[PDB]
Each structure stands twice: as structure tokens, then as C-alpha cells.
């Protein structure tokens, strides 16, 4: 069966509603559902379900000509009405999609014929096509599977147009997908993929070591990083490590003492030897980040000045701001208040715990007391939603989210970035500029606005960038080279060719 593979995922794939979020897993939604236009590594989108498109002079009305040969896996036609119904279904839940600005921009969607689909926008929203390309929410389920003509209250069968079809799913156990034999595009070489549900990282490693699974593909939490390095030298195995796809960083709460002070935030940015942290916790498998977005990210090659590890400069910044060492204590004080910052993370995540310990030790060296608050996932997500944190671990979202969608989301009060930026005096101006860059036509103004947004965020030391992380792969050699999806949450099973 060299055309059947078995892999693993920490949880089951979810209901596979194309228009909702947790517990729906994005890789799975992208296996079954498809976009109008498809995102490529070079930054462009290509025709997909939409073979072509045009837009009005003012850039608010877009007309897409759809392929006419596409069926949903249940035999029903994909056409403009089915696509229009889908857009209606998503936008009936509009407030759930506020993180994504396209959802606030779409004013009308209508099927002009079986093959003409017209979409009207509030303003000339430039990242229109890119946002249509995302795994969710703008992808298409057969309208017969709506519940009372909606999807926001659940779907019936997860029927998409894509190259994979969900065969069966056992809560807590394993999800099976099968090749769509009536797929409009190219047939995948693989016929069956089984995801075993294996929540724990070392347990995933052991399963691969026993031969229970054939493939592991994911970000830096996929399996323990020490095990990954040993696997990469093991000639019985195949491993890969991609070029970096996103930033991992700390977000500092600019509205809470003592991270409300610019001097404290700048000092913490000089306190951490990031190469040491990576070589200590991450087994040298990731790259040092000095900036919220890597210089390879669109619009973000700005010559921003790194804050190199420099504990002497960190101490001086603290001293100049009145944070001094009492005799004979290691932790600074100002106005009888200790320099204490809470770092909250998921307490069962061993890699978070390690990095957090390194951060705490590096900051103690400059006289800052970091207390580690490890809590369950729900509590942590509530904290970020609510701004109940001093520092948190946080990541950017990779291409094509970075930078436009990630910045867009900083305006949304329930996103951790808004909460972290809440105390900045120029936060109103930053959000106005974010709104402007997304609507702007003038390419020179677009670049100025990105420059200003990113430069203010860097200079205000809202973040502590740590590393640019990569996708990792571990596989049985028989599977061959495993390609990457140009979107970070997607796994390109359709292109595996043993």
C-alpha cells in the first residue's frame, strides 16, 4: 500500500465546517474545500475555481468568471449560485470574521449567471484576492449541506470540491481521508491518508520510531526538538526543515505596569541572547529574529535597527528610568514596587516552559523578576483576549497573512496584539494608518504607511522578537521528498509522489 499513508495530529479534524474555526483544523478544511483563487509561493494568486476576473475603475466591484466543469464530491454542480450562497452563509456570521477585514468589506455577492460571480466592496480593499485564497472562511461547501440555508449553526456532510474527501472520523482516535476520484484538477498519487490522534509530542516520536506512522509535518512543536535533531542524522529516516515561515516573539503589555514603560520594554529587548535561547531550547533548529517581521516579508525590508543582546545597555536603560537595585537584592525597585512581570503560557507545553525558563533567567540578570504563570489552554486564550498578561508568547501567521492580515487584526480588541498595544499614545494613529494601508491605491503611499506602522511598533518595543521558525518534516524514506504548501497551515498531500 505505497499509496496509503498514516500520519498524526494532536486532535481530531473537527466537523469540517468551511466557515467556522475551533475545533475545525485548518489543514483538513484546506484538503476538502477550495478557494476561487489559489495562493502561490511568489506572492501572486492564480486562477482556481475562478478561471478569470476583472474589476471596476474604482476597484470596488469585482466580477469572476468561474470554471464550468467543477462538481462537489457529491455530484452537485459548483457554479456561481453555489458560490454566492456560500458568501451569504459566511457573511451571515459577519462578526465572527472581524479579525479578517475582507469580511467587513463585502457589501454584496451575486450570481450574474452560472459562471459570472459579482462581488461588491465597501472600499478598494487591495488584499482582496489574497484573502479569498485563505483556508477559511471563503471556501465552498455544497449548498445542499447547509442547515436551514446557513452554515454558522453547523453543516450536514462536509462536501467540498477538493482532491480529498473525509471518509470517517472517530473522536479521540483517527480521521481518514480518501482521494476524490471525480476531482476537476490533477489526481493525487496518494489514495488514503489516516491521521492518528496523538496529543503528546514525545508520543508522536515514539509512534514514528515504532513504524506506527509514516509522516509528521508541522511547526516547531511537532515532536521534541532533541529527537528531531537525532532523527535528522538517522539514516533509517528522512527529515526536512523548511526556510522560516513566521516569527515567534513575546508580546509586552503596554497598558500594564511595569511593561507600560518604554524604558522597561527597550531594556527587555536588550536582555535576551536569542542565539543562546535557540541553541539551548530549540537545539539550534531555528533562526534569530530581531524584528516583528523578517526582512524577507513583503513591505518589511526597512533597515530597522536590531536590539543586539547587551545586558549592560539593558541595565543602563533601567537605571535611567529609576529602577535600581536595593541592597542586597537582585530584583530592581522603583517607588517601593519590584520590577516584576508575569509571563503566562500553556503549562503543559514543555517547549514553552523551557523557553520561559530561559527568558526568566536572562531577565533576572538585568534585575527583572519574571514569574511564570503556566495555565491550561482556555485560560491562556481568555487572557490574551482580555489583556490579562504582562508578557505572552505569540506568533505571526506566515504568508499571505504577513504583513497585511496580521496588522489588520491588531485593530480588533479581542486580538492579543491590540491588547498588548492598548497603552501606546500613538495606538489611535497606528490603527488609522492600518485602515489606510489596506485601502490605498498609491503604491508609494502603501509602502510609507507600512514603514510607519512597523517602525512605530519596533521603536515602541511592543514586541520581543525571538526567532523565525520553520516547518519540520519527519518521514519514512519510501515517501520521498515532501513539498511545502505556500500557506503555513496547509499540508500539500496532493503533491506527495512516491
What does this 3D model show about the protein?
It is classed as transport protein. The entry lists the keywords metal transport, transport protein. This protein folds into two domains: 1-242 and 471-498, D-Maltodextrin-Binding Protein, domain 2 (3-Layer(aba) Sandwich); 243-470, Roll (Dipeptide-binding Protein, domain 3). The protein contains 15 helices and 21 strands. The protein has helices spanning 26-32, 80-91, 102-105, 128-132, 201-210, 225-233, 262-270, 274-281, 311-320, 350-364, 377-386, 404-408, 416-421, 427-439, 443-459; strands at 4-9, 37-39, 45-47, 50-55, 61-66, 106-111, 116-121, 146-147, 150-155, 164-170, 174-179, 192-197, 215-218, 238-252, 287-288, 333-334, 337-338, 340-346, 369-375, 391-395, 463-475. The strands form six sheets. Strands 13, 14, 15, 18, 19, 20 and 21 form a seven-stranded mixed beta sheet that branches. It has a four-stranded mixed beta sheet with strand order 1-12-11-10, with no helix packed on it. A four-stranded antiparallel beta sheet has the order 4-5-7-6. Helix 7 (262-270) runs antiparallel to helix 9 and helix 14 (427-439) packs antiparallel against helix 15 (443-459). 44% of the residues are buried.
